[PDB]
């Protein structure tokens, strides 16, 4: 919608924060 803005919440953009999350939490989220 022609916003520049820009907002980044894509994986590529939050991986740094994701990598710091405790693996056991990633297990549960991935287990659904």
């Amino acid at each position: 919608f022609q916003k520049f803005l820009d907002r980044r919440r894509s994986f590529r953009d939050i991986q740094g924060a994701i990598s710091k999350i405790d693996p056991e939490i990633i297990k549960s989220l991935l287990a659904s």
């Binding site: 919440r9 894509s10 994986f11 590529r12 939050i14 991986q15 740094g16 924060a17 994701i18 990598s19 710091k20 999350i21 693996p23 990633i26 297990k27 989220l29 991935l30 659904s32």
Partner: protein, 167 residues
């Protein structure tokens, strides 16, 4: 810190590496064998980069849940392989990262043949999810792993960089 040096490694790398992972040592005390067993697990990581409905809906859900925690594009197989790798750990000697560490050597699987032909499940899955090259390089406190959707052959220039960026 670690993520910085992981990004450093592939933002200067000779070829195009998709990601880089530091597998980190720890020790858990198994009271049965009395062995302070050494285990490799997720330390940090850096993804750089370049399916079906049931799959992509599953992945998109996970990504927005993490987004909810921290704070809608499709999720490529390499991004997804990178992420699910956070779940994996390796007893010393076991698997591609554990073999590299226990034996203090570099293990270079180049080409889709190498990956599937290795008999390492992590390398096999990697081929499934778009990787063409997998490398594990042992350092002092763990293993640095590089992966790529391209096919890359053993450069000492790489093993050079890794030795520098890590003790």
């Amino acid at each position: 810190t670690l993520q910085q040096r992981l990004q450093a490694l592939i933002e200067s790398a000779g070829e195009n590496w998709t990601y880089a992972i530091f597998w980190q040592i720890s020790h858990d005390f198994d009271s049965s064998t009395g062995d302070n067993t050494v285990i490799l697990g997720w330390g940090d990581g850096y993804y750089k980069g370049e399916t079906n409905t049931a799959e992509q809906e599953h992945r998109k859900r996970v990504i927005r849940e993490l987004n909810s925690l921290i704070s809608d594009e499709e999720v490529t197989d390499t991004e997804w392989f990178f992420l699910v790798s956070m779940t994996q750990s390796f007893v010393n000697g076991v698997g591609l990262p554990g073999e590299s560490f226990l034996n203090s050597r570099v293990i270079w699987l180049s080409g889709s043949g190498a990956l599937t032909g290795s008999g390492c499940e992590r390398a096999g899955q990697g081929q499934i999810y778009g990787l063409k090259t997998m490398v594990c390089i042992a350092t002092q406190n763990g293993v640095v792993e590089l992966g790529s959707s391209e096919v890359i052959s053993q450069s000492s220039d790489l093993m050079h960089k890794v030795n520098n960026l890590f003790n």
